[PDB]
Symmetry: C3
Subunit: 288 residues, 3 copies
């Protein structure tokens, strides 16, 4: 919200339009190591955040920071490769700028991916967790992308998140996972946002499991919130890249350097899976 | 604390004095839909935050933002209709400016009202929860109105909140509720502050119940903290305006638009109840 | 991290070097009432934060704010008497400036002390809790000293804290406590950071015990995080100065004014104990 003015979004959206023949309907934010989805697009038109009017440029990850309008599995997409994270200093109203821009672009759906740790034991590093809900930890303390005066033009002052992650798409996906006979069922769970670079400590790991979080991460939640605030049908997954050490028997890891899950075909499984799901995303056409 | 200087408070308080024949003893902050209490005052003298020297002006709610010095049930009041919330961008040292101003006005008691969600099942939308305690969620993370250098003139560096909500007034109220034979006993509980516009998700609803919160809201706590820091006898209620969905059987709501609880006579029950309680508030006179 | 530039640290470290004949290996941050350790140093050379190039000066506690390079029990130290706390308005990247400076000074170990409340019943006011882990509460919400672009020169973007408090030194201390026959075993536990001046309320006391915190405080965690980010072997204790009231049978206290624990010989027991432990701290020499 804060920082930009509606015309900032207007301006950026419009410029994007007057610069891409494409008019997307689906906005996809690729987590770490899931940027590969950008390869699944046709008629791809790449834009470096850099060259886009108000778009936050990136920090070190910048050397992996672009917005690509393509076409994914029978849907006008606009993938964002390399999202913005709070721990990079981006105030949340910047992290989520793009989600507000997309809405203005005409995007009606936002599929949000992300690599995350595993709090739930049943998760196996590599798994893919359908996000059914979220525990916005930094929001409790004020770190919410909607802080500041509300832009009625975008949405309500007190949006409900109880329904964030689309029930329809979550069912029309637990099923689709079945469809291609993916062996092990698409895990489903609650993702807990946690900001700050550092990785949880076993003590923190436990207050996260107790709170009910199935997976932990440092993003998504802010983009879901404003996507919701906008209307944007929202659904997304979480590629468990490493299991968090819930007890003092350490010497066992969960390194991001050890993102190799996302540095494997795990990321590839979630990518194809997201492409197929383009078919499950409702069209703005309808047609009975 | 921060942002203003002691003379900012001095100045504003004094101006208020040199502008109102009244010298209040009780400061009341009306929650959403409880501003009606302003109607229960006699010799009311209204001041738009706007016209008061350092008082934060409001955002959209501004079109419901004034401080009215009246007289409530045998007590010199100063009601604040439409409080400041963190999610409106007000840094906490602005949200709570008024509480510090009141103290300088001579106010010795602060009754804080607020509309909130219902985490405790025994609560019925419409209920009125006496605040016995609070879980300051944004304070854990730094969002405390006392951050910054401490003004010894106002209080201690490390105030205790263990005793925030006055035991005396809480008992001299559970009783008073009995007095007028109000049918169902005045519920009592722990209010949990949660900032950010958004409404909790079922996942968040559950970490709130587990933490021990009886009701959830986006205010009060900051004003209680500095009121305490000042001395200010503090007691207040929480008008359960909607029950929070603790489980995935949604399609059931808790809309603020659906503030109709506070958009009913519920707000009226708490208002009269607060007026009567003016009698239970100790006087600075004493007189055996 | 943020606020300063690497050359700010470079500059301050170097100035410190070109101003102290000493080259420390161990950096000690004294909690409240544990500054006394400064008396256990030989060839002590005191520096007021004030006179050091980029070092945050202090607020009221300033009248107890210096960095003393001495020699503690056969180790080149650099004690910091009176640490910086978030609740004083210091952004975390200032609270922890010194830890980053020390590393540049050549310091390889950081022993962090702190006075804290007692959530665990088995703790007796006066006890000394070896910090085995921590629950960084303000970090979940964004208040992490590493927010902002990461300085690869100092460390990784996603440091692990699972191993923060050195296992070696924690065992080579539970033992050392035995060594001098200290009667009651060196308590060990999880410290929970909580910012904001205020002291927890019974409601907050309980969400702290439930989260798994053995003791509560308003510091250490930020300095541990960046110490870790740097490499810095980290271990530290927590002098339980008062038991937190976990239930509504109050009129029982935990005043910081009632820091007399730390205002006793309790602080003295932890101080000597820290001096002896200088012997357990590995040398950069090695020598079989
Ligand atoms: N907090 C957290 N995030 C993780 C973890 N594993 C992956 N992520 C996602 O952010 C870092 C990329 O690996 C983990 O163990 N903890
Ligand atoms: N967080 C939260 N606040 C509420 C709820 N209901 C009322 N409030 C008070 O703030 C919004 C006004 O209705 C609710 O369900 N959740
Ligand atoms: N939060 C908290 N910190 C404490 C307590 N006792 C000591 N400390 C450490 O910070 C204040 C110094 O006493 C306590 O009860 N609560």
């Amino acid at each position: 919200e804060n920082g930009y003015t509606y015309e900032d979004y207007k301006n950026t959206a419009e410029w994007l339009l007057s610069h891409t023949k494409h008019r997307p309907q689906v906005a996809i934010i690729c987590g770490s190591g899931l940027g590969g989805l950008t390869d699944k697009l046709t008629q791809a038109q790449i834009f470096d955040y850099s060259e886009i009017p108000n778009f936050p440029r990136s920090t070190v990850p910048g050397h992996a920071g672009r917005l690509v309008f393509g076409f994914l599995n029978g849907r006008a997409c606009v993938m964002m490769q390399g999202r913005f994270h709070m721990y990079e200093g981006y105030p949340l109203w910047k992290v989520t700028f793009p989600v507000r821009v997309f809405h203005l672009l005409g995007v009606d759906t936002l599929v949000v991916t992300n690599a995350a740790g595993g709090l739930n034991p049943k998760f196996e590093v590599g798994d893919i967790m359908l996000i059914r809900d979220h525990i916005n930890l930094p929001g409790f303390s004020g770190q919410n992308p909607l802080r500041g005066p509300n832009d009625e033009r975008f949405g309500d002052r007190f949006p409900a998140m109880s329904d964030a992650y689309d029930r329809t798409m979550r069912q029309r996906a637990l099923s689709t996972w079945k469809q291609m006979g993916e062996q092990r069922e698409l895990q489903e769970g609650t993702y807990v946002m946690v900001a700050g670079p550092s990785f949880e400590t076993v003590a923190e790991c436990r207050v996260l499991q107790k709170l009910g979080a199935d997976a932990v991460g440092m993003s998504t939640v802010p983009e879901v919130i404003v996507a919701r605030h906008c209307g944007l049908r929202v659904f997304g997954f979480s590629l468990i890249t490493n299991k968090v050490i819930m007890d003092y028997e350490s010497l066992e890891k969960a390194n991001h350097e050890e993102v190799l899950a996302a540095g494997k075909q795990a990321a590839q499984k979630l990518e194809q899976f997201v492409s197929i799901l383009m078919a499950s995303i409702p069209l703005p056409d309808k047609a009975s």
